[model samples]
Target: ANLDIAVYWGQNFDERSLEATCDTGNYAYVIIGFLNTFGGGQTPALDISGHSPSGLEPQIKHCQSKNVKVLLSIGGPKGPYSLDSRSDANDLAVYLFNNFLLPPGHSENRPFGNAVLDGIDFHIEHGGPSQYQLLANILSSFRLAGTEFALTAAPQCVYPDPNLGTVINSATFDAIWVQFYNNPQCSYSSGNAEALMNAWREWSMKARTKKVFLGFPAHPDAAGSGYMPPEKVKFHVFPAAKKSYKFGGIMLWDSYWDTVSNFSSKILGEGW
Candidate 1:
């Protein structure tokens, strides 16, 4: 079956430019991370590995021209972003729509200038999960008048992610890219695909999203654990994962590591 591939951009300074990354035509979606600072009266900040916001507009537009859906990822592992209450979540939704998702030339201080991103990817790794549903609801409400804004999540492979489980069950997400790395309990290990496949079964069967993606580290060093080589993933993991109708394909952690390991090319070459 033909499946879509997604990659996370930013976080690595040495990665290719956003345009160059999409130019390869290997990825269907390119998520630009992250809006790392927000909530508690703190201004939200866009951190794209030190790339100049002034110069990113054209690059983002160029990627979109190639039919690549670009999304701005909010929250990383160490960002001080969290909602204290429902009001905080609502405010955040408004901020995201006005700043990033609004049409070009519609809002001021847009980090990527006039480039309007396709959607938002919640990569919330830290914080309480209480108000995330509220945030998702408010963001969803903005999709009136036939507006198509995608909302996705990247949760850890643990069945029901510790941080995003609650909201993910209750909220509406276009897709959920469950990270099958770092957490040893469900992540892949050498000669051991049992744990990972088990978790994939749960995520595929349970997540509310229509699409469930198997997320991985493009290079072994990109993550502390669960870095399976391309051949192993194709031979061991793909067969099991493809059994599910919800399977949406693979998600790589960052563009830089993908280039270094040539993971996407090799995996795609083998056919999905």
Candidate 2:
């Protein structure tokens, strides 16, 4: 079963939400997105203005209980998340470990109170500090400090990503979901996945992670374009890419679109 289906929790979670996603038997990871810097702050923090404590926390627990991993995704297309220097990166790593990973009376800041998130995801869309590579290294090391974590990144399909290229190679990541939508040069579109396959090969050759997911928009309108039909994925690109040892699975852009579209079931299928 090569069904490593992951989705971003962009919207809220409710009844038939976590269970519905998991019942498909394809869902594995759920990343909580955009823990960006709030207004007028150099330090990036979790923005919980739009989040409801009662709504999301229980669902996270529910999913995690079902052997589904949940991660806190940092950064977005519009973000205040630049490391600027190695010091900034170091400070951030310590801060992250203390607040997010550190547990018990020792852990002062817990965004989800007692519930610890499984990991962190780098969705660094734009530019940030000069030494993000070092930042990633520090976080990777933080695992030894009694913190359980896995690292992941959502990079663009342009070979090495422009924003996090340097860091990605040097960093320790469990999975890398290369965004194959929006970019025509590497996205699957119009019955063609040549460019997408080429890019996947490049990512497989370059990335250190064993698991690499081909990320796509769940809907045609989700990300301007690059929306391949599920039939095509199940028949075409996947058959080709599955030969590679690093072909872990596929990732959708977000949960909201995936909910209405039912794309997961189609791609992963009843057999899944």
Model 1 clash pairs? none
Point out where model 1 deviates above 4 Å. Answer: 104-107, 270-272
TM-score of each: 0.95, 0.89
Off by over 4 Å in 2: 11-24, 38-41, 47-49, 53-55, 270-272
Candidate 1 on 1-272: residue-level lDDT in tens? 46578999887777788889999888999999888988878878878889887688999999999999999899986777887787889888988888788865553577788778899999999886868888988888887645588999999888888788987897589998999999889989876988998899899999998899999999989999999988898898888888888889999987989878889988888332
**Model 2 per-residue lDDT tens digits across residues 233-260:** 8787787778888887988876777776
The local lDDT score (0 to 100) that residue 203 gets in candidate 2 is 90
- In terms of lDDT, the poorest run of 10 residues in model 1 is 103-112
How many residue pairs collide in each prediction? 0, 2
Instruction: Look at candidate 1 and tell me the lDDT of residue 190.
Output: 73
